[PDB]
Amino acid sequence: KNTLARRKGRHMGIGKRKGTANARMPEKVTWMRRMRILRRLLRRYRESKKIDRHMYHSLYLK
Amino acid sequence: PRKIEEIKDFLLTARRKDAKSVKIKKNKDNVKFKVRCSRYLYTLVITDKEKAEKLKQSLPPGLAVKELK
Amino acid sequence: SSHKTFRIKRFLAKKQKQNRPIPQWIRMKTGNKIRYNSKRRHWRRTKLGL
Amino acid sequence: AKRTKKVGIVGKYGTRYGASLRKMVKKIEISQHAKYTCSFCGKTKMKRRAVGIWHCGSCMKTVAGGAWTYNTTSAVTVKSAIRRLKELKDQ
Amino acid sequence: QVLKFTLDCTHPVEDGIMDAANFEQFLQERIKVNGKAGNLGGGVVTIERSKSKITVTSEVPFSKRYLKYLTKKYLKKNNLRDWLRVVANSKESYELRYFQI
RNA sequence: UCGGCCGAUCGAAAGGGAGUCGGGUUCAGAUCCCCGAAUCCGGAGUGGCGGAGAUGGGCGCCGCGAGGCGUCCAGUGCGGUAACGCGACCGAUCCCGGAGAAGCCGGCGGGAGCCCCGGGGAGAGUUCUCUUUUCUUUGUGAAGGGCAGGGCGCCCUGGAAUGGGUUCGCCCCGAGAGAGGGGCCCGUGCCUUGGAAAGCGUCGCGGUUCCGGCGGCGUCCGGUGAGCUCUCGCUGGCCCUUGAAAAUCCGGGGGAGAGGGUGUAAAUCUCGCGCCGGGCCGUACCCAUAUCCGCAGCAGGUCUCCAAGGUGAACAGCCUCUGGCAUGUUGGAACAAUGUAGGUAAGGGAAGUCGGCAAGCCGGAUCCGUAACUUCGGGAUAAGGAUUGGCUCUAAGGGCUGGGUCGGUCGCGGCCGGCGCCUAGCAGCCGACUUAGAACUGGUGCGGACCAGGGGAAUCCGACUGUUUAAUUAAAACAAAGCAUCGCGA
RNA sequence: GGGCGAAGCCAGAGGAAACUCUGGUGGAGGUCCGUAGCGGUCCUGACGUGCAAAUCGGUCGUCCGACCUGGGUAUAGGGGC
Ligand SMILES: [Mg+2]
Ligand SMILES: [Mg+2]
Ligand SMILES: [Mg+2]
Ligand SMILES: [Mg+2]
Ligand SMILES: [Mg+2]
Ligand SMILES: [Mg+2]
Ligand SMILES: [Mg+2]
Ligand SMILES: [Mg+2]
Ligand SMILES: [Mg+2]
Ligand SMILES: [Mg+2]
Ligand SMILES: [Mg+2]
Ligand SMILES: [Mg+2]
Ligand SMILES: [Mg+2]
Ligand SMILES: [Mg+2]
Ligand SMILES: [Mg+2]
Ligand SMILES: [Mg+2]
Ligand SMILES: [Mg+2]
Ligand SMILES: [Mg+2]
Ligand SMILES: [Mg+2]
Ligand SMILES: [Mg+2]
Ligand SMILES: [Mg+2]
Ligand SMILES: [Mg+2]
Ligand SMILES: [Mg+2]
Ligand SMILES: [Mg+2]
Ligand SMILES: [Mg+2]
Ligand SMILES: [Mg+2]
Ligand SMILES: [Mg+2]
Ligand SMILES: [Mg+2]
Ligand SMILES: [Zn+2]
Numbered sequence: 051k052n053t054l055a056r057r058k059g060r061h062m063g064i065g066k067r068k069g070t071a072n073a074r075m076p077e078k079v080t081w082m083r084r085m086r087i088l089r090r091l092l093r094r095y096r097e098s099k100k101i102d103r104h105m106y107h108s109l110y111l112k
Numbered sequence: 113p114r115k116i117e118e119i120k121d122f123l124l125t126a127r128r129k130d131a132k133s134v135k136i137k138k139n140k141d142n143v144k145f146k147v148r149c150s151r152y153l154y155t156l157v158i159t160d161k162e163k164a165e166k167l168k169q170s171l172p173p174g175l176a177v178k179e180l181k
Numbered sequence: 182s183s184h185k186t187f188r189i190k191r192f193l194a195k196k197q198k199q200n201r202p203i204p205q206w207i208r209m210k211t212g213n214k215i216r217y218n219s220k221r222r223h224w225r226r227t228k229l230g231l
Numbered sequence: 232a233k234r235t236k237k238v239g240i241v242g243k244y245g246t247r248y249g250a251s252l253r254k255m256v257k258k259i260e261i262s263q264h265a266k267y268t269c270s271f272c273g274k275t276k277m278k279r280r281a282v283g284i285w286h287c288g289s290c291m292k293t294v295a296g297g298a299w300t301y302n303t304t305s306a307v308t309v310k311s312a313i314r315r316l317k318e319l320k321d322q
Numbered sequence: 323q324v325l326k327f328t329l330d331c332t333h334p335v336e337d338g339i340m341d342a343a344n345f346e347q348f349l350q351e352r353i354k355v356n357g358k359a360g361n362l363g364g365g366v367v368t369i370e371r372s373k374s375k376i377t378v379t380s381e382v383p384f385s386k387r388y389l390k391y392l393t394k395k396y397l398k399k400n401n402l403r404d405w406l407r408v409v410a411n412s413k414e415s416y417e418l419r420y421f422q423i
Numbered sequence: 424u425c426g427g428c429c430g431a432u433c434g435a436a437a438g439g440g441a442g443u444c445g446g447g448u449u450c451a452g453a454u455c456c457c458c459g460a461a462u463c464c465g466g467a468g469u470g471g472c473g474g475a476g477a478u479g480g481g482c483g484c485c486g487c488g489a490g491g492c493g494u495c496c497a498g499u500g501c502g503g504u505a506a507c508g509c510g511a512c513c514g515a516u517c518c519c520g521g522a523g524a525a526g527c528c529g530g531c532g533g534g535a536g537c538c539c540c541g542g543g544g545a546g547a548g549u550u551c552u553c554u555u556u557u558c559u560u561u562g563u564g565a566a567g568g569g570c571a572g573g574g575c576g577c578c579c580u581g582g583a584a585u586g587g588g589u590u591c592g593c594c595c596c597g598a599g600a601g602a603g604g605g606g607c608c609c610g611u612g613c614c615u616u617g618g619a620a621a622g623c624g625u626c627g628c629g630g631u632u633c634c635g636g637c638g639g640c641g642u643c644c645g646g647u648g649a650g651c652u653c654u655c656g657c658u659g660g661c662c663c664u665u666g667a668a669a670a671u672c673c674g675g676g677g678g679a680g681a682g683g684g685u686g687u688a689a690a691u692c693u694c695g696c697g698c699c700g701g702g703c704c705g706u707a708c709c710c711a712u713a714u715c716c717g718c719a720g721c722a723g724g725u726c727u728c729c730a731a732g733g734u735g736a737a738c739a740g741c742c743u744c745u746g747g748c749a750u751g752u753u754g755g756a757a758c759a760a761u762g763u764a765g766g767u768a769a770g771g772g773a774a775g776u777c778g779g780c781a782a783g784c785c786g787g788a789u790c791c792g793u794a795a796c797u798u799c800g801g802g803a804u805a806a807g808g809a810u811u812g813g814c815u816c817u818a819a820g821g822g823c824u825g826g827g828u829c830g831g832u833c834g835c836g837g838c839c840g841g842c843g844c845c846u847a848g849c850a851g852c853c854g855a856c857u858u859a860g861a862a863c864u865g866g867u868g869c870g871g872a873c874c875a876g877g878g879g880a881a882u883c884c885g886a887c888u889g890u891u892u893a894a895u896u897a898a899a900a901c902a903a904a905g906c907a908u909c910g911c912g913a
Numbered sequence: 914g915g916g917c918g919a920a921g922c923c924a925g926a927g928g929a930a931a932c933u934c935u936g937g938u939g940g941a942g943g944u945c946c947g948u949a950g951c952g953g954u955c956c957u958g959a960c961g962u963g964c965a966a967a968u969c970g971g972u973c974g975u976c977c978g979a980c981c982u983g984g985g986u987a988u989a990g991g992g993g994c
Contacts, residue, residue: 052733053539057856058816065811065870067788069736073915074788075857079649080820081938082531082591087821089589100846103601104585112924113460114567115616129472130697137620144616150697152567153460155616180620184436187704225714232935235919238800242919243941247887250798252905264660264920272598281665289576289598298663354555387544388555398550409626410545412640 114152119167122156125149126172133176136168189231196222196229240264263299277301325384329376329393330417334406346371348396355382389416 055061067074089110096106116122122145126134130150137144143164145156158164171177185193203218222229235242240260241253269277272290280286285296297303331342346369355363362368367380378389390408393416397403411417 055814059857060814061812062857063811063813063869064789065787067736067811068734068870068874070788070915071858073736076649078530078591078939080857082649083821085591085938098846100848103587107587110589113617128696135620137618139619144618146616151461152696153617155618157616182436183707184705190705225720232937233933236799238919240920240941242800243944244800244919245887245942245944246798246800246802247943248798248904249886250800253798253800261920274598282663284665291576357555383542385543385555391555395550395554403550410640411626413544 114154116154116156119156119163122147122154122167123170123172125154126175131175133178134171135178135180136164137180138164192231193229259299267301323381325378325380325386326414327378327380327384327386327389328415329378329389330374330411330415331376332374332417333419334402335374339405340400340402342371342374342376345393345396346376348399349376349378349392352392352395353378353388355384386410386414386416393418 052061092101092106092109095101096103101109116125125131126147128149132148135146135148137146141159143158143161145158145164145167147154156167158167168177199220200222201218202221203215207213207215238244238253239257241257244253263279265278266275267277267285268275269287269290269292271292272287274287274289276288277285277294278288279299280293282298283295285294285301286292287294294301297306329345331340331345334340335342350362350369351360353359353362353367353369355367363382366382367378367384369376369378371377378384390410393408394403397406397408397418405420406418407421408416408418
């Protein structure tokens with residue numbers, strides 16, 4: 051029951067947090083997810099001919 | 113254990129000198145013929161029943177034909 | 182310990198065998214002068230030599 | 232962004248050991264951990280394995296060099312001198 | 323796509339400690355289909371009796387353990403829980419019998 | 424003729440070291456007994472059976488052809504461009520190499536076990552009202568075969584700048600990228616033989632004073648993840664530190680030799696199966712607030728493995744499940760002083776005291792905001808300030824598939840094509856947590872327990888981290904890097 | 914279990930260059946807070962014919978390193994260390 055409430059956002063707040071924001075959700079893990087999601091999208095765009103090699107390589111570095 | 117694939121290999125396996133006994137296990141889906149040799153237990157799996165019954169009467173004599181049911 | 186040598190196990194075997202009461206008929210012998218086994222050993226009170 | 236003004240690689244030492252000792256070890260630690268261009272295969276993969284031992288990852292060539300640099304200025308003049316004396320020795 | 327579960331009220335009705343008519347009268351308003359009690363979810367779940375046998379036939383995914391949950395709820399309401407006991411006598415079938423001393 | 428372990432021997436129940444697992448069984452033993460499945464090493468002289476070696480061409484003849492006879496010549500296997508593969512695949516002294524055989528730390532990824540979620544069963548719990556509810560349970564060993572999956576600094580084609588590929592980070596490439604196609608290793612995962620006959624859960628029926636009794640049914644389908652623990656792998660970092668040895672096993676180089684005259688053949692065989700054997704010693708139990716040491720059933724000491732739910736950053740603290748226990752060598756009745764341990768205290772706030780000793784204040788997280796000084800790294804959580812509950816929402820952060828212009832037709836379906844423009848990207852399905860914002864709301868209470876820095880200005884000493892008088896001194900003492908001096912060419 | 918965030922790297926901006934600034938990434942250190950462990954500051958607390966011939970309570974120091982620890986070895990008395 052309490053887990054279902056926490057899905058909707060209850061009991062999260064500011065007075066319910068004891069660990070650091072990085073201890074609760076690490077920045078390195080957040081960066082990995084973002085890199086994996088974005089690099090996957092760029093790859094799928096390259097093999098579907100939406101972008102070429104040169105636009106892919108510019109955006110990969112970006 | 114070793115799994116015998118086709119029918120013929122089981123016959124001369126059962127006709128070996130070290131073959132102690134053959135056990136027949138009737139499952140819901142298949143019939144298994146397990147001959148107990150010196151090193152391995154050779155199992156032959158028969159899907160249907162007419163071939164299993166045919167194999168039952170074609171077994172070499174003088175060998176234990178223990179039925180597991 | 183559980184791991185032991187044969188010489189140690191044989192040593193412990195003798196100590197078990199001689200740690201027993203005197204037989205009751207000893208006290209009936211002529212001129213006995215023995216009341217009890219005075220060399221009785223308990224595993225917790227006194228420890229063995231080894 | 233540039234993270235330190237002057238300490239650079241010796242920022243790992245904190246405030247310890249003295250500024251001049253950290254400055255002294257700074258240039259040695261930079262050359263100690265640098266990757267040199269291999270003179271055998273041409274790749275920039277010749278890195279220190281142990282003190283005096285320099286190994287290339289590509290051609291797997293191991294060279295005996297200096298403690299902190301791939302070659303010492305002492306040994307370079309020596310190689311030039313030995314070459315000069317050898318060509319003087321024969322004719 | 324037909325479930326056809328069965329409830330067997332034989333030993334208690336022959337001892338007269340309960341009647342199958344009332345137990346049938348208990349089920350049709352307590353059975354929930356898609357979370358709604360009453361009207362059997364639009365009549366999709368049907369109910370009938372053989373004067374001892376009460377069979378539940380459904381055309382939607384319907385759990386057998388729900389009948390045991392509902393039957394145990396009836397027995398507690400009628401103070402029969404301390405004597406009777408729902409036991410799965412087979413698949414698609416429940417049967418309530420006495421505690422064996 | 425060849426022959427250096429160039430040195431006996433001992434030295435590890437945590438190093439090296441072939442090969443046993445599943446089920447049952449006792450009052451007390453089991454990876455040891457029983458049942459069933461394997462496996463390692465050693466042996467076979469009179470050679471145990473197969474298979475391999477290895478059994479083909481040439482010429483004369485006969486023969487309708489096919490096929491038979493004689494003679495001669497081969498034959499210590501074969502396939503793939505390659506990586507390498509196939510069931511064997513002659514070979515000594517000698518030589519070369521490998522494995523054994525290697526630190527610590529970081530970050531990723533694969534696999535398992537556990538945890539979690541959604542259903543289907545079986546049995547229990549609650550039912551005052553509600554709860555399709557809550558709880559329990561819902562197997563497949565070793566060893567083979569096959570297939571996933573992971574890895575490769577392995578091969579072939581080809582030749583790349585408008586450089587490209589690519590990781591969380593990196594890193595890689597004319598010494599051969601990308602791409603296409605292959606090969607190898609690991610395979611603890613899945614399926615299969617083992618295997619359901621066993622085990623387990625339920626519901627029954629008989630009894631052999633104490634049945635591995637008999638029987639019915641079931642042992643199902645999914646989804647998740649920075650989760651935890653093992654394990655496997657990849658890639659880095661650190662070292663004036665470079666993190667054993669030896670038994671033992673294997674591969675290669677070389678070709679001394681051996682084997683037969685064309686035979687149902689030989690030498691030989693790391694291939695399949697079959698036969699025999701594996702001696703000696705240890706093995707119970709405790710392993711600690713009672714089986715050990717401390718004189719004792721002593722609040723001390725004594726090396727390890729496994730490790731659930733909630734909260735939470737968490738192996739914290741607090742509560743709980745499995746498992747365990749009986750409060751630590753006694754109880755009863757009262758509730759004096761003094762004590763030991765723990766709290767509170769109006770007003771004042773260190774006036775107490777050698778001395779703020781002791782206690783108290785602060786404390787988590789978020790958003791701001793942070794001085795002198797400084798070896799420029801720090802100081803720094805400086806200092807200082809605001810907020811924190813509950814409830815109802817709103818945004819944002821992903822993954823999977825499918826995008827056809829159609830009968831011109833028959834393999835209400837399939838091979839090509841006249842047959843069309845998602846190209847500002849849509850449609851459906853599934854899925855974790857996390858952040859931000861808003862409204863409402865309670866006697867302003869909200870890190871509500873637990874967890875959990877008081878701060879600033881200076882002076883002395885020691886640079887720091889480290890160490891020290893076990894049992895009255897942890898310090899400014901010792902050590903330290905740095906600096907300097909001295910001896911020494913064997 | 915958290916904090917700080919060294920080198921290396923990416924992007925953007927400013928620069929004639931030299932280079933500089935900003936945002937990320939990365940994860941160093943006899944680094945910090947703090948478990949287990951190791952130690953033993955203060956109460957000059959408890960106890961002081963004790964639980965104990967050195968223990969106990971709270972509070973403490975350190976907690977990736979000159980770290981903690983088992984077993985096997987070596988050094989023996991004017992000697993060892
Ligand atoms: Mg004792
Ligand atoms: Mg020895
Ligand atoms: Mg036992
Ligand atoms: Mg299985
Ligand atoms: Mg390539
Ligand atoms: Mg069964
Ligand atoms: Mg034992
Ligand atoms: Mg004790
Ligand atoms: Mg003693
Ligand atoms: Mg006691
Ligand atoms: Mg008490
Ligand atoms: Mg008591
Ligand atoms: Mg007061
Ligand atoms: Mg006051
Ligand atoms: Mg005063
Ligand atoms: Mg005074
Ligand atoms: Mg104080
Ligand atoms: Mg300050
Ligand atoms: Mg609010
Ligand atoms: Mg000091
Ligand atoms: Mg100084
Ligand atoms: Mg000490
Ligand atoms: Mg002392
Ligand atoms: Mg000085
Ligand atoms: Mg530290
Ligand atoms: Mg610290
Ligand atoms: Mg002291
Ligand atoms: Mg005292
Ligand atoms: Zn090189």
